[PDB]
Amino acid sequence: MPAYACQRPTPLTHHNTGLSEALEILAEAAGFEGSEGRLLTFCRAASVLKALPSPVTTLSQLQGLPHFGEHSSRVVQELLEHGVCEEVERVRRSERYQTMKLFTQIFGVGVKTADRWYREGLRTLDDLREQPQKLTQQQKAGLQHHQDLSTPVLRSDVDALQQVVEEAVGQALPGATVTLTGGFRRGKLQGHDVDFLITHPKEGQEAGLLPRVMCRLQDQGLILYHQHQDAFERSFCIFRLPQPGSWKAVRVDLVVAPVSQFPFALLGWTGSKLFQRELRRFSRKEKGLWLNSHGLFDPEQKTFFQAASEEDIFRHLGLEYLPPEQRNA
DNA sequence: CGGCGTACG
DNA sequence: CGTA
DNA sequence: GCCG
Numbered sequence: 001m002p003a004y005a006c007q008r009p010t011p012l013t014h015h016n017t018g019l020s021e022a023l024e025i026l027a028e029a030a031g032f033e034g035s036e037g038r039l040l041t042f043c044r045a046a047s048v049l050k051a052l053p054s055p056v057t058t059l060s061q062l063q064g065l066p067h068f069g070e071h072s073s074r075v076v077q078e079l080l081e082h083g084v085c086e087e088v089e090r091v092r093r094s095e096r097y098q099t100m101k102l103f104t105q106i107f108g109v110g111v112k113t114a115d116r117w118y119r120e121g122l123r124t125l126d127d128l129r130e131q132p133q134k135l136t137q138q139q140k141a142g143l144q145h146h147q148d149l150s151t152p153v154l155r156s157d158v159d160a161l162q163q164v165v166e167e168a169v170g171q172a173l174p175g176a177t178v179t180l181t182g183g184f185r186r187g188k189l190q191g192h193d194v195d196f197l198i199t200h201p202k203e204g205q206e207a208g209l210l211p212r213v214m215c216r217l218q219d220q221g222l223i224l225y226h227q228h229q230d231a232f233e234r235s236f237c238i239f240r241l242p243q244p245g246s247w248k249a250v251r252v253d254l255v256v257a258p259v260s261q262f263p264f265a266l267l268g269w270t271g272s273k274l275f276q277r278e279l280r281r282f283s284r285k286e287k288g289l290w291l292n293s294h295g296l297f298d299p300e301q302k303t304f305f306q307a308a309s310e311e312d313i314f315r316h317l318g319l320e321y322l323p324p325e326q327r328n329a
Numbered sequence: 330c331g332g333c334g335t336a337c338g
Numbered sequence: 339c340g341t342a
Numbered sequence: 343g344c345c346g
C-alpha cells in the first residue's frame with residue numbers, strides 16, 4: 001500500500017465503508033477545530049481503507065498500512081470489537097459538532113464564520129434568519145435555498161442541465177465545449193452540485209467567455225444566484241432545475257480554461273478533493289514539480305510542462321494512470 | 330522536529 | 339472572508 | 343495524527 005492516495009486506485013464503492021465513515025467523522029471534527037494536520041491524517045487513513053481489496057476483520061490487518069497509528073488503529077479496533085467507537089459517537093452527538101456541521105453546510109459559510117456564530121451562542125438556521133443584518137448576500141441566498149441545496153443532485157438531472165448550459169455557451173462562443181467534471185465524472189450517482197468545465201479548441205478564444213455565458217443564463221431566467229448578477233473564470237451559482245409541476249434550486253459550478261490548460265483543469269476539477277491535495281503534495285515533495293489546475297511547473301528549469309491529456313500529466317509525474325472512477329480517494 | 334494544496338471571487 |  |  002503506497003503512502004500517497006494518487007499512487008493507488010480508489011473506487012467509489014469498497015469493502016470498508018463503515019470504518020472509513022467513522023474515521024471521516026473524526027476528520028471533519030478536527031477541521032471544525034482548525035486542526036488541519038489531524039484532519040489530513042484521518043482522511044488519509046480512511047482513504048487507505050477505501051483502497052483495500054477486502055474487508056478489515058482483524059486489527060493485525062492494519063499492520064504496515066500507512067497513516068494508521070495508535071489513534072486510528074484504536075478507532076478501528078473498537079468498531080471491530082463492539083460495532084461502535086465511543087469517541088466517534090461522542091463527536092456525533094456533541095452540540096459543537098452538530099452545529100458546526102449545520103452552519104458550514106450553508107453556501108457562503110465556512111469554518112471561521114460558523115465558529116464565530118457558535119461562540120456568539122447561535123445554534124439553528126432560524127437563529128440566523130432572525131438576525132439577517134449580519135449576513136452577506138451570498139449567505140442570504142445560501143440560507144434561503146438551504147433546504148433545496150441539502151437535497152442530492154441526481155445523475156439523471158445532469159444531462160438536461162448540461163444541455164441548457166451548452167445552449168448558452170454556444171451562443172456566447174460558437175465551438176466552445178462543456179465537459180462534466182467533479183464527482184459525477186468519477187461515477188457518483190448523486191452530488192452536492194454539478195461541476196462543468198468550459199473551453200474552446202482555439203487557444204485564446206475563451207478569454208472573456210464566462211461573463212457572456214452567465215449573462216445568457218441569467219437572461220433565460222435560470223440563475224437564482226450568482227456573484228455577478230469585471231473579468232472572471234469561475235462561477236459558483238444557484239440554478240433553477242425543473243421538477244414535476246415545479247422546480248428546485250441546485251448548485252452549479254462553471255469554470256473556463258484555455259485549451260492548453262484543459263488537461264490540468266480537468267484533472268483538478270475531477271477530484272476527489274483529497275486525491276488532488278495528495279497529487280499536488282506528491283508532485284512537489286517527491287518530484288520537485290509544482291502542480292495546480294493551470295499547469296505543472298519545473299522550478300529549476302523555470303518551465304511549464306505541456307500536456308495534451310490527463311494521461312500526459314500522470315506520465316510526467318511518474319505515476320500509473322488512474323481513470324476518474326479510481327480517483328475516489 | 331516541520332510539514333500538511335493551491336488556486337480564484 | 340468566501341469558493342473549487 | 344502521522345510520516346519521513
Ligand SMILES: Nc1ccn([C@H]2C[C@H](O)[C@@H](COP(=O)(O)NP(=O)(O)OP(=O)(O)O)O2)c(=O)n1
Binds near residue numbers: 192195271277342
Ligand atoms: N477544496 C477543494 C474543493 C474542490 N476541489 C476539486 C476536486 C473536487 O472533486 C472538484 C469539485 O469540487 P466539489 O464540487 O466541491 N466536490 P465533488 O464534485 O467531488 O463532490 P460533490 O460534493 O460536489 O458531490 O474540485 C479541490 O481540488 N479542492
Ligand SMILES: [Cl-]
Binds near residue numbers: 292293294335336
Ligand atoms: Cl488551482
Ligand SMILES: [Mg+2]
Binds near residue numbers: 183191194195
Ligand atoms: Mg461537485
Ligand SMILES: [Mg+2]
Binds near residue numbers: 182253342
Ligand atoms: Mg463544485
Ligand code: NA
Binds near residue numbers: 103108
Ligand atoms: Na459552507
